Design a protein around this motif. Structure first.
Motif, PDB file in Angstrom:
ATOM      1  N   UNK A  21       0.855  -1.184   0.000  1.00 46.57           N
ATOM      2  CA  UNK A  21       0.000   0.000   0.000  1.00 46.57           C
ATOM      3  C   UNK A  21       0.889   1.231   0.000  1.00 46.57           C
ATOM      4  N   UNK A  22       0.488   2.240  -0.764  1.00 49.73           N
ATOM      5  CA  UNK A  22       1.204   3.499  -0.748  1.00 49.73           C
ATOM      6  C   UNK A  22       1.092   4.144   0.630  1.00 49.73           C
ATOM      7  N   UNK A  23       1.842   5.230   0.817  1.00 52.48           N
ATOM      8  CA  UNK A  23       1.701   6.011   2.036  1.00 52.48           C
ATOM      9  C   UNK A  23       0.320   6.636   2.143  1.00 52.48           C
ATOM     10  N   UNK A  24      -0.336   6.870   1.011  1.00 49.29           N
ATOM     11  CA  UNK A  24      -1.686   7.406   0.960  1.00 49.29           C
ATOM     12  C   UNK A  24      -2.761   6.327   0.960  1.00 49.29           C
ATOM     13  N   UNK A  25      -2.384   5.058   1.091  1.00 43.30           N
ATOM     14  CA  UNK A  25      -3.344   4.014   1.376  1.00 43.30           C
ATOM     15  C   UNK A  25      -3.811   3.216   0.185  1.00 43.30           C
ATOM     16  N   UNK A  26      -3.088   3.257  -0.932  1.00 47.52           N
ATOM     17  CA  UNK A  26      -3.564   2.657  -2.165  1.00 47.52           C
ATOM     18  C   UNK A  26      -2.746   1.437  -2.542  1.00 47.52           C
ATOM     19  N   UNK A  27      -3.460   0.388  -2.938  1.00 49.71           N
ATOM     20  CA  UNK A  27      -2.847  -0.774  -3.561  1.00 49.71           C
ATOM     21  C   UNK A  27      -2.082  -0.317  -4.794  1.00 49.71           C
ATOM     22  N   UNK A  28      -1.071  -1.078  -5.173  1.00 49.95           N
ATOM     23  CA  UNK A  28      -0.174  -0.751  -6.265  1.00 49.95           C
ATOM     24  C   UNK A  28      -0.299  -1.817  -7.348  1.00 49.95           C
ATOM     25  N   UNK A  29       0.134  -1.545  -8.574  1.00 52.28           N
ATOM     26  CA  UNK A  29      -0.095  -2.508  -9.652  1.00 52.28           C
ATOM     27  C   UNK A  29       0.966  -3.593  -9.731  1.00 52.28           C
ATOM     28  N   UNK A  30       0.667  -4.559 -10.596  1.00 48.03           N
ATOM     29  CA  UNK A  30       1.499  -5.742 -10.758  1.00 48.03           C
ATOM     30  C   UNK A  30       2.877  -5.375 -11.280  1.00 48.03           C
ATOM     31  N   UNK A  31       2.925  -4.456 -12.242  1.00 46.98           N
ATOM     32  CA  UNK A  31       4.191  -4.070 -12.852  1.00 46.98           C
ATOM     33  C   UNK A  31       5.107  -3.365 -11.859  1.00 46.98           C
ATOM     34  N   UNK A  32       4.537  -2.689 -10.864  1.00 43.85           N
ATOM     35  CA  UNK A  32       5.321  -1.962  -9.874  1.00 43.85           C
ATOM     36  C   UNK A  32       5.697  -2.844  -8.691  1.00 43.85           C
ATOM     37  N   UNK A  33       4.857  -3.817  -8.352  1.00 45.63           N
ATOM     38  CA  UNK A  33       5.101  -4.668  -7.198  1.00 45.63           C
ATOM     39  C   UNK A  33       5.788  -5.977  -7.545  1.00 45.63           C
ATOM     40  N   UNK A  34       5.970  -6.281  -8.824  1.00 34.42           N
ATOM     41  CA  UNK A  34       6.598  -7.529  -9.192  1.00 34.42           C
ATOM     42  C   UNK A  34       5.755  -8.764  -8.995  1.00 34.42           C
TER      43      UNK A  34
END
Ligand SMILES: [K+]
Ligand SMILES: [K+]
Ligand SMILES: [Mg+2]
Lengths: 62, 114, 93, 86
Positions: free
Chosen positions: A24-37
């Motif tokens: 989760x970002x610092x602002x509370x959001x899930x992140x995408x597959x390409x960014x999280x591996x």
RNA sequence: GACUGGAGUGCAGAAGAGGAGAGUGGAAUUCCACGUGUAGCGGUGAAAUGCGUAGAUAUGUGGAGGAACACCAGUGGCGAAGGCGACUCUCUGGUCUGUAACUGACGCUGAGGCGCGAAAGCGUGGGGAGCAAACAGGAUUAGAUACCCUGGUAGUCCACGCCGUAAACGAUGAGUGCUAAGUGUUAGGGGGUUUCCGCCCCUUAGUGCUGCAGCUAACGCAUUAAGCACUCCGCCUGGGGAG
């Protein structure tokens, strides 16, 4: 390289806040597959876990 | 007396800038209309600067050195207004967003020319 | 069916009051067609956001087996209706 | 429909001790499933996606039933009263 | 009569916004109250109508109400199609992979019937925050029964029941087999190597890109054929009148 697929840990639990907070970002959001591996299956599973945690107030929205 | 918060509502039509206390009581405000503008000129960075400066140099009634700034809307004058609040003689401590985003709640009105 | 439950008890509760509430919902689960295999705590930990003026809360767990789920349903409605549980969740394994 | 109940209702009508792929077995299990689904529909009347699979079960049952009738008629006139058809 | 590559059951696994019900969460629009608070706000190509000193605009706190559910989220998943995205539970459907256990052609299509079927709309009773046909006012215009602005009723939402239409479209009927490749992507299985990891190859069902043959009036389709063949159904026979 995906964490879960590279480590063989197939289960995900919505209570491991210390391990889900990496995605989760610092602002509370899930992140995408390409960014999280991640991979697709485990990314669905992380969505489910994160949402259950958020609804238990274990992670924030904002 | 020492620190304030600035709320800028910048839009494609006008810019309002309100200085308040940290627990939310108004001390002052200004806009391009009170500044003296009448049309689309309200929507400009120059009007943004001027209204910001008027706001801050009235906020020096009860005085302050520091501001936390909070920016709302798509108005282009946020840069000019923040530069105004830095250069008027105040130490803007941080900038932050008040983008009033719904997670697909109530719908917008229609697009134009439809 | 393997059921798991989690819940959150409020901060303004002393230990006797709190253990009473815990044991009472455990009774409500097990007096029905279910048998608590386990029930646990993390602790009075911090909530990611404020439900009320409350911002701390007591995280508790109940690992369970059941077939009828009337345990689950009584637990759910009674915990919502009680002024002590501000949050609870139930999951099927 | 649970595995244990399924095993029960296949083994109690199996023609012989190895068999769980006969029309007797299939028609029985289908009658179990379609009756449970009739209840499901009478509760949730507007779950037409479930009603689809219902009617597929009914069709497969009728298909097996006609084949059995053509094959050996005694099996047929037995099963209808053993199960509750017709 | 017999057999198993079709068809199905069993057995071991895997995915999924497949459907119905009940409950639940916080963003966020609006409204109510209360402080601070002073003369504008809104909107346009310019404006004006309109709201505002009976005090807004904004700003914070608390409360009410409903509608939809960001990120994830992707020519990605599922479904016969319509379509299905917040979470949990219950009740349910279907799909794929592997096995060769079981039956042994039980199958394909399918007129006529039966049901489902976007949105709009209809009846009864609720709800109604926003958006909004109609409508009112303001502009625009030569005129404007419109685009544009400010407001705004039906509706949109729910329960039940009707309506049964669609650029309901992949404008491409369902089924079977056969006929080069390259590459992503999804869900699986098998094997070589390696400390798992990781790489590689083979294979199954999907989903997409580009392309050989071949077809096509061409555009282009190309193992997800618009190719080569067989079964079945539906439909066409110049435009309009005329659905
Ligand atoms: K109506
Ligand atoms: K469509
Ligand atoms: Mg409708």
């Amino acid at each position: 390289v995906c964490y879960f697929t590279s480590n063989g840990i197939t289960h995900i639990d919505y209570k491991d806040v210390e391990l889900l907070k990496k995605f989760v970002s610092e602002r509370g959001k899930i992140l995408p597959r390409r960014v999280t591996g991640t991979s697709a299956k485990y990314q669905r599973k992380l969505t489910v876990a994160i949402k259950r945690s958020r609804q238990m107030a274990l992670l924030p929205f904002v | 007396i020492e620190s304030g918060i600035a709320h800028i509502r910048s839009t494609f039509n006008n810019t309002i800038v309100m200085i308040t206390d940290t627990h939310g009581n108004a001390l002052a405000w200004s806009s391009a209309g009170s500044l003296g503008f009448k049309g689309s000129r309200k929507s400009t960075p120059f009007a943004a600067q001027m209204a910001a400066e008027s706001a801050a140099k009235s906020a020096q009634e009860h005085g302050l050195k520091t501001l936390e700034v909070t920016v709302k809307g798509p108005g282009s004058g946020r840069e000019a207004a923040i530069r105004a609040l830095q250069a008027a003689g105040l130490e803007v401590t941080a900038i932050k967003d008040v983008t009033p985003v719904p997670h697909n709640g109530c719908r917008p009105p229609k697009r134009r020319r439809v | 069916r393997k059921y798991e439950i989690m819940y959150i008890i409020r901060p303004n509760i002393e230990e006797d009051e709190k253990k009473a509430v815990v044991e009472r919902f455990d009774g409500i689960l097990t007096e029905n067609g279910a048998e608590i295999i386990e029930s646990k705590e993390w602790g009075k930990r911090r909530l990611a956001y404020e439900i009320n003026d409350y911002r701390d809360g007591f995280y508790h767990i109940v690992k369970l087996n059941a077939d009828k789920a009337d345990s689950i349903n009584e637990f759910d409605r009674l915990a919502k209706i009680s002024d002590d549980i501000i949050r609870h969740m139930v999951i099927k394994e | 429909l649970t595995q244990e109940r399924k095993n029960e209702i296949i083994a109690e009508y199996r023609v012989h001790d190895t068999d769980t792929g006969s029309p007797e077995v299939q028609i029985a299990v289908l009658t179990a499933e379609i009756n449970s689904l009739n209840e499901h529909v009478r509760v949730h009347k507007k779950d037409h996606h479930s009603y689809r699979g219902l009617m597929k079960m009914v069709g497969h049952r009728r298909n097996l039933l006609t084949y059995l009738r053509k094959k050996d008629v005694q099996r047929y006139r037995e099963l209808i009263k053993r199960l509750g058809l017709r």
